[PDB]
Amino acid sequence: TNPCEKHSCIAVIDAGSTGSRLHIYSYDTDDTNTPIHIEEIWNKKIKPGFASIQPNSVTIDAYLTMLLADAPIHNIPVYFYATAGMRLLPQSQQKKYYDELDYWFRQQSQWQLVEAKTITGNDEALFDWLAVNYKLDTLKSVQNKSVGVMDMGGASVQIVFPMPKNAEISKHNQVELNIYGQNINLYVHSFLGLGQTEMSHQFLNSPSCFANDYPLPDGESGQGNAPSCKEEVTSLMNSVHKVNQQIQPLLALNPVNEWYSIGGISNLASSQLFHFENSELTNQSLLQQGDNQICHQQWDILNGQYPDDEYLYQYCLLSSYYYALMVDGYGINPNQTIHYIPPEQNLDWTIGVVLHRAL
């Protein structure tokens, strides 16, 4: 069966810093031609990030072929939206990637490329909030509670929550959204350089951030201590980026009732070393588990016991960093529940694109 013969279908590609994810969505539309019944009918993910690969024909051909070739439906519109990995590069370097990608799409006849472009972290934050609230079924009716969303990426992190329009705040950080006949005002912010890969490049020689005896590039040995690593990461959040100064006053005035996180935190929280129930965690418990299970354990033993976790060596650092970002940066209480979407649900911001081309 091809659902796309009976329902509208589009393909959306999340071209993230650490990899690209193709989704094919089928949907119907209600009275205003707004999508409903959105279903993912195909998903494929590849590594590494599109902005990391050499921008020549042969490399981009291998990459796009790997991403698209085995898709069961090809004669549909395609949106290719890159996020913070491409935002790291100047517009001149990005142009080479889009020229090669445009050329590739023109060498074949099935996929109809609608747009290929780098979106801003503010657009990425709006799509993050739309994607999670569509899954929560909170978009069709006016809500009593405030839902905030966090997306933990490899190069940037987003935070987005309801906030009335404020003339003192940049226009770029505020979005007025009309969807399903309701009007929604959002604060959006993205912090470029505070994603997990970029942040980690500032702490690779910090012994407190690695399991005991992990080999640091300077020849010293890891000596893990999550509260100590967390204080180091907080200097990058607040002394450098001023996360606390920008976010805490706004959340004080516009409290969030439920927090949902997507991105890398879902993967860490779901791993064998951590234990959380009901797809929810607290920062207090995340930091204590990371400290006890990873930071204070012997690297050779951990490495041999978890040979499939390719991110294991960063788990002490990540536990520390997520705490630094959420508690010290955003001002979230260490005991506050944070929901995370299970990784097997393949939920990224791309559902937001399905919804908001129509609004």
Quick one: which of 14, 100, 128, 198 contacts a copy of itself (CB under 8 A)?
Answer: 198
Report the residue from 30, 32, 53, 181 that binds Cl ion according to the rule CB under 5 A.
Answer: 53
Question: With binding defined as CB under 5 A, does residue 153 bind Mg ion?
Answer: yes
Choosing among a copy of itself, Cl ion, Mg ion, none, which partner's interface includes residue 16 (Cβ < 5 to 8 Å by kind)? Mg ion
The yes or no reply on residue 52 touching a copy of itself (CB under 8 A) is: yes
Q: Mapping DSSP to helix (H, G, I), strand (E, B) and coil, where does residue 226 land?
A: helix
Q: Shortest distance, CB of residue 22 to Cl ion, whole angstroms?
A: 19
Identify which range of 27-35, 114-122, 176-184, 279-287 contacts a copy of itself by CB under 8 A: 114-122
- Partner whose footprint covers residue 177, from Mg ion, Cl ion, a copy of itself, none (CB < 5 to 8 Å by kind): none
Does position 213 interact with a copy of itself (CB under 8 A)? The reply is no
Say whether residue 203 binds a copy of itself (CB under 8 A). Answer: yes
Give the count of beta carbons closer than 10 Å to the beta carbon of residue 333.
11
Residue 9 assigned as binding residue = no
Which residue, 60, 62, 67, 64, is CA-closest to 100? 60
- Cis status, amide bond into 48, omega within 30 of 0: yes
Contact between 308 and a copy of itself (CB under 8 A)?
A: no
In the complex with Mg ion, the residue whose CB is nearer, 328 or 348, is: 348
- Name the minimum Å distance from CB 120 to a copy of itself: 5
- Answer yes or no: is 219 a known binding residue: no
Pairwise CA distance, residues 162 & 149, whole Å: 10
**Alpha helices (H) along the chain:** 57-68, 84-87, 91-106, 121-136, 196-200, 226-234, 243-253, 264-269, 283-290, 299-305, 315-323, 350-355
Partner that binds at residue 49, options Mg ion, a copy of itself, Cl ion, none, CB closer than 5 to 8 Å by kind: none
DSSP label of 224: -
Q: Reading across the β-sheet that carries 258-263, which strands appear in turn?
A: 174-179, 182-192, 156-162, 147-152, 258-263, 337-340, 280-282
CA 151 to CA 128: how far, in whole Å?
A: 7
55 binds Mg ion (CB under 5 A): no
Residue with tokens 């706004």: 250
Cβ atoms 98, 135 nearer than 8 A: no
**Contact pattern from residue 153 through residue 192 relative to Cl ion, giving x for each residue in contact according to CB under 5 A and a dash for the rest:** -------------------------------------x-x
The count of C-alpha atoms lying within 13 angstroms of the C-alpha of 170, restricted to the half-sphere facing its C-beta, is 6
Which of residues 202 and 346 has its CB atom nearest to a copy of itself in the complex?
A: 202
Find out whether 45 is annotated in a ligand binding site. Answer: yes
Residue 166: alpha-carbon gap to chain centroid: 26
Which of 155, 318, 325, 327 binds a copy of itself (CB under 8 A)? It is 155
Q: Hey, what's the torsion of the CAs at 58, 64, 68, 74, to 10 degrees?
A: -90
Q: How far apart are CA 332 and CA 159, in angstroms?
A: 12
Contact predicate 188/254, CB 8 Å: no
Is position 120 an interface residue for a copy of itself (rule: CB under 8 A)? yes
114 binds Cl ion (CB under 5 A): no
Residue span binding a copy of itself (CB under 8 A) among the ranges 231-239, 261-269, 275-283, 329-337: 231-239
* 222 in contact with a copy of itself (CB under 8 A): no
Does 16 sit near Mg ion (CB under 5 A)?
yes
Selected from 2, 29, 32, 54, the binder of a copy of itself by CB under 8 A is 54
Q: Would you tell me how many other CB atoms lie within 10 Å of the CB of residue 228? A: 16
Number of residues binding to a copy of itself, judged by CB under 8 A: 41
Start-to-end C-alpha separation, the chain:
30
The CA angle 211-213-218, to the nearest 5 degrees, is: 100
Binding site for a copy of itself (CB under 8 A): 48, 52-54, 59, 84, 87-88, 90-92, 118, 120-122, 155, 170, 172, 190, 192-193, 198, 201-205, 215, 217-220, 232, 235-236, 239-241, 310, 313-314
Residue positions forming the annotated binding site for Mg(2+): 4, 105, 108, 111, 235, 239, 272
